[PDB]
UniProtKB/Swiss-Prot annotation:
The gene is ADCY9. Residues 66-74, 122-127, 324-351, 397-404 are cytoplasmic. Belongs to the adenylyl cyclase class-4/guanylyl cyclase family. Adenylyl cyclase that catalyzes the formation of the signaling molecule cAMP in response to activation of G protein-coupled receptors. Contributes to signaling cascades activated by CRH (corticotropin-releasing factor), corticosteroids and beta-adrenergic receptors. Residues 42-44, 146-166, 292-302, 373-375 are extracellular. It is found in: Cell membrane. This is Adenylate cyclase type 9. The chain crosses the membrane at residues 21-41, 45-65, 75-95, 102-121, 128-145, 167-187, 271-291, 303-323, 352-372, 376-396, 405-423, 426-446. Signal peptide: none annotated.
Amino acid sequence: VNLEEACLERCFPQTQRRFRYALFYIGFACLLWSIYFAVHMRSRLIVMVAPALCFLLVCVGFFLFTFTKLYARHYAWTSLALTLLVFALTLAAQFQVLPTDTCLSQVGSFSMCIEVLFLLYTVMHLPLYLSLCLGVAYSVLFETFGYHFRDEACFPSPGAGALHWELLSRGLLHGCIHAIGVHLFVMSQVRSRSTFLKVGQSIMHGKDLEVEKALKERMSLMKDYFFKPPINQFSLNFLDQELERSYRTSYQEEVIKNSPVKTFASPTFSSLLDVFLSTTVFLTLSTTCFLKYEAATVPPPPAALAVFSAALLLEVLSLAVSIRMVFFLEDVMACTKRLLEWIAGWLPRHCIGAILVSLPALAVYSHVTSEYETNIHFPVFTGSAALIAVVHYCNFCQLSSWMRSSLATVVGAGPLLLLYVSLPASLIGQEVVLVFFLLLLLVWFLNREFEVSYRLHYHGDVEADLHRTKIQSMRDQADWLL
């Protein structure tokens, strides 16, 4: 329990820094999310533009509260207070909006549901059990208010049979968000705690070395560690070149050395869970897309069916490789182990990872056809599904954040290019830009932070082993003299 209180005490500056950036993001979000609310929904500024301006000062008021000493004792309470306020406004926002100029597309609200639910799982530093329920609470209240308060005048009501299976669409996407959300939370908590123990062991060995050195001869840093990392701020590469090459190769030798898996922070175990979500994020997302056609009794295109077989098989092979990489079945031959050594390399992981991460992303865009403009529900469903495909790019934290989220930006630009070619249509096109730009900003920030945390975890590991090896070298010399 004392190590628990110490850990929150030592990593409090990280919690404070992340919280301030969420304060900047929400205020920055409300600045541009409400400008187009004021302009493109000019008929009703009474109910929509006012709350956003009010909450902007609340974010500033929260921002001012951060510098006070009372914040440090109840940083958890402050996050919960912000979470309820952010939960309430955006949840109640999807209600007051619901004549064509007064209706907001079902994609715009979903982006608010994503960024809000990704500040909770990543930045509020709220307990997992309460974060999961609040995240689900913001999800069930999001879906169960749109159905209640749907405006049939703006969006024509589809078939009754289609509505029931479309509930799976609302549920399954929200589930994907939480599955990414919990994993994003779990890995952040694991890497922060594992680094703390490694720094705790590193400082412990440093003091122990001096006691040993004296016997042989006779015969605040951790705060700056979490605040001033040994990493350049732009490219996120390590300042030391020998460490950077060590980090880039750090994955393969552990595969070569068959290092046993001890905790979730192991790169092989991290990749196994990382590849695992990619399959479920694919399997749940692609399940959602296909059930739309069954509800509309229109056969799916064979090309979309064709990519799925290649996509699932690639997921099946990649998943099977990871389990064999972690558990090492005894009947593996040396030829495949060399291949297992090869994929573990830095560039091979990026080439494989880029395919693995982008796989649910290309799943959504394989269903786009020339009939994309026939039904108005198809683009709003594709846009809603495209958001999570971009959201999936926060996974695979071992890859470079620049490489991953840029593919998300490329993938996030897929629907945009479709809309420009197709071009209420003009108004939605601008909304989707604001939908994704705010969303792509979050993935840019979130991927940057978690690569830093992942890189610091490795940096904490080598410093722990560098100091630990110094202990064994000195102990052998010390006992030899004895």
